[PDB]
């Protein structure tokens, strides 16, 4: 549970937003890329796993599950690469709701920057700091500190 | 002290590596950019502060301390922007030693990727996971969790 993350790919403005969600907390990291390739996804996972103790990633589609570059990054970074089959049907819903919330936030900040990447990092910040009372950023730290102890 | 970070700029292969270090733990985030500008530094701090509870940043030089774009991102993200004067002379040495360790790690992985940005993210991963016993990634989570509690 503390080490499990889910990849999610959404689209805006003709670009791709790649998201990793820490499933137990709802905390996210995200980036804009011009298209989802195995190299971009592999690089994104390398970044994530240098920052948080990523044990397992549920990939966002079969092409990223198949990609030998993504499998190579997961090998390098010590991550168990898994499929993203929603054996719990509530998973599809949680991810659709997250993309809709993120896109809502991006539209709320969109005029505050020229480049979509800037708006998406403002949206990561607001999402992670939003009190629901704890924020997603507080929950991930507590979950992982509990695991370390 | 759980919220205090230090910016650091180092050079390799004709490029710039921008580093944020969490002072109490030694944990780092880093990125490669073609040159250190106010916009690149402001974007980097926006990313950092959406991922960790960044209260204070000691900027790496007077150009980033002065930059109105850097000041605007620190306003947006709720960061107190401070200068980086090493009132403790041990601060100079610690940053120099970190740059030398990071460049050593980059040389140890350099032939495992074409692009320097890849090598630098491998080096962030190795640095954050190295036990010296706890790793910097463990120390930062424990420090912030203690603080939330
Ligand atoms: C001279 C700055 C260029 N713009 C000006 C702009 C252009 C259009 C609308 C608003 C603005 C505006 O000032 N908003 C406030 C602001 C300030 C700093 C800030 O720092 C994170 C983010 C936002 C902001 C910007 C900075 C760094 C970036 C960007 C962009 C971008 O516009 O996307 O892209 C990647 O790094
Ligand atoms: C598949 C083509 C790309 N190369 C091949 C390569 C070129 C030269 C030397 C070694 C290799 C090699 O296979 N090493 C192992 C490896 C695999 C996956 C991995 O994923 C993080 C990092 C490393 C690795 C790469 C992937 C993603 C990127 C990169 C680069 C890069 O070379 O820098 O740049 C930004 O995203």
Numbering used by the authors:
A (entry chain B), B (entry chain A): 57 to 188, 193 to 209
The authors write:
IN is a critical enzyme in the HIV life cycle as it is required for the integration of viral DNA into the host chromatin, and therefore persistence of infection. One component of this complex is lens epithelium derived growth factor (LEDGF/p75), which has a conserved IN binding domain (IBD, residues 347–429) that mediates binding. Within the IBD is a loop (residues 362 to 369) that binds a pocket formed by a dimer of the HIV IN CCD. We herein present a novel, small molecule inhibitor of HIV IN that binds to the LEDGF site, discovered through fragment based screening and structure based drug design, which has low micromolar activity in both biochemical and cellular infectivity assays.
From 7, replacement of the p-methoxyphenyl group led to 8, (R1 =  cyclohexyl) which gave 100 µM inhibition in the AS activity assay but with loss of SPR activity, whereas 9 (R1 =  p-MeO-phenyl, R3 =  allyl) retained SPR activity. Analysis of the crystal complexes of compounds 6 to 9 suggested that branched amide analogues could more effectively fill the pocket, so we synthesized compounds 10 and 11.
